[PDB]
Design a protein around this ligand. Structure first.
Ligand SMILES: [Ca+2]
Length: 243
C-alpha cells in the first residue's frame, strides 16, 4: 500500500483533533487540507514514526508548530486515544516533559467555569453517565431531552449556556437538525455525541466542531467541554471588546 492509502483511514480523526484544537469546523478542516496538499506535493516531508497515524499527527503538529501545547497534549491522550509515549512522539518532546505538559493541562482542563447545560440523549444510561461527569466538573444539568420537541421546549424554558446532543433520537429524527433550530436565535457551544464519528469527519460539508464518540472515555467528554468553554470565553471576550 502507498502513503495515500496508508494515511487516508486516519484523516477523519485528524480533522476531529484539528477542530478541537482550533474551535471551528472551517479552521479545523482547512489545516488538515493544507497538510494533506503539502504531503501530496512532496512525500518526503512525511516524518519517520512508529506508525502511519503517529506520523500523520506529527506532520500536522509540526506544520501547526491553535490552542496551547498542554491542551494539545491532553487532547491527544483524552480525545485521540494515544498513550503518553505516542503523544510525546507526536509532539516531539521527551516522555518526562510530556508528563509535566499533561499535569499543567489536567489542572486547566479540570478547572472549568460552572455552566448550565442541556443533554439531548434518549438512552437513559448514556444520559446519566454524561450528567454524572458534567456534575463532577461543577456544571449544572438543566434537564435531559429525549426528542426534538422536548429539546426545543427545554431550551426555551431553561435557556442553557451549552448543549451536549446525541446525533439520533428516540424517533428517527436528527439531533443535528434539532440543535440547528436553537443555533438560529442564539449561538451557543454544542458537543455532539455519536456512535459513528467518521460519518461527520469528512470535511466535505457542514459538520460538528466537537464530537464525542459513544461509548466514551469520560475524559474525552471532560476534554471537549473544556475546549468548548475555552473558545466560548475567547469568542465572548473578543465580541464585547469594543464596548
Ligand atoms: Ca458588550
Amino acid at each position: 500500500m502507498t502513503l495515500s492509502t496508508r494515511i487516508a483511514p486516519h484523516l477523519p480523526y485528524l480533522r476531529r483533533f484539528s477542530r478541537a484544537l482550533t474551535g471551528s469546523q472551517s479552521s479545523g478542516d482547512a489545516y488538515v487540507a493544507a497538510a494533506l496538499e503539502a504531503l501530496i506535493a512532496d512525500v518526503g516531508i512525511f516524518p519517520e514514526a512508529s506508525s502511519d497515524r503517529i506520523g500523520l499527527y506529527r506532520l500536522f503538529c509540526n506544520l501547526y508548530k491553535i490552542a496551547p501545547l498542554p491542551r494539545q497534549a491532553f487532547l491527544l491522550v483524552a480525545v485521540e486515544g494515544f498513550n503518553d509515549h505516542e503523544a510525546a512522539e507526536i509532539l516531539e518532546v521527551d516522555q518526562a516533559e510530556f508528563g509535566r505538559l499533561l499535569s499543567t493541562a489536567s489542572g486547566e482542563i479540570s478547572r472549568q467555569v460552572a455552566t448550565r447545560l442541556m443533554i439531548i440523549e434518549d438512552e437513559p444510561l448514556i444520559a446519566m453517565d454524561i450528567e454524572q461527569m458534567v456534575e463532577s466538573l461543577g456544571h449544572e444539568v438543566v434537564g435531559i431531552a429525549r426528542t426534538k420537541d422536548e429539546a426545543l421546549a427545554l431550551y426555551e424554558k431553561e435557556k442553557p449556556r451549552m448543549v451536549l446532543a446525541d446525533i439520533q433520537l428516540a424517533d428517527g429524527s436528527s439531533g443535528i437538525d434539532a440543535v440547528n433550530e436553537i443555533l438560529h436565535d442564539n449561538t451557543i457551544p454544542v458537543i455532539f455525541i455519536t456512535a459513528f464519528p467518521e460519518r461527520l469527519l469528512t470535511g466535505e460539508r457542514p459538520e460538528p466542531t466537537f464530537l464525542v464518540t459513544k461509548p466514551f472515555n469520560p475524559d474525552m467528554v471532560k476534554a471537549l467541554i473544556s475546549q468548548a468553554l475555552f473558545f466560548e470565553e475567547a469568542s465572548q471576550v473578543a465580541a464585547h471588546h469594543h464596548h
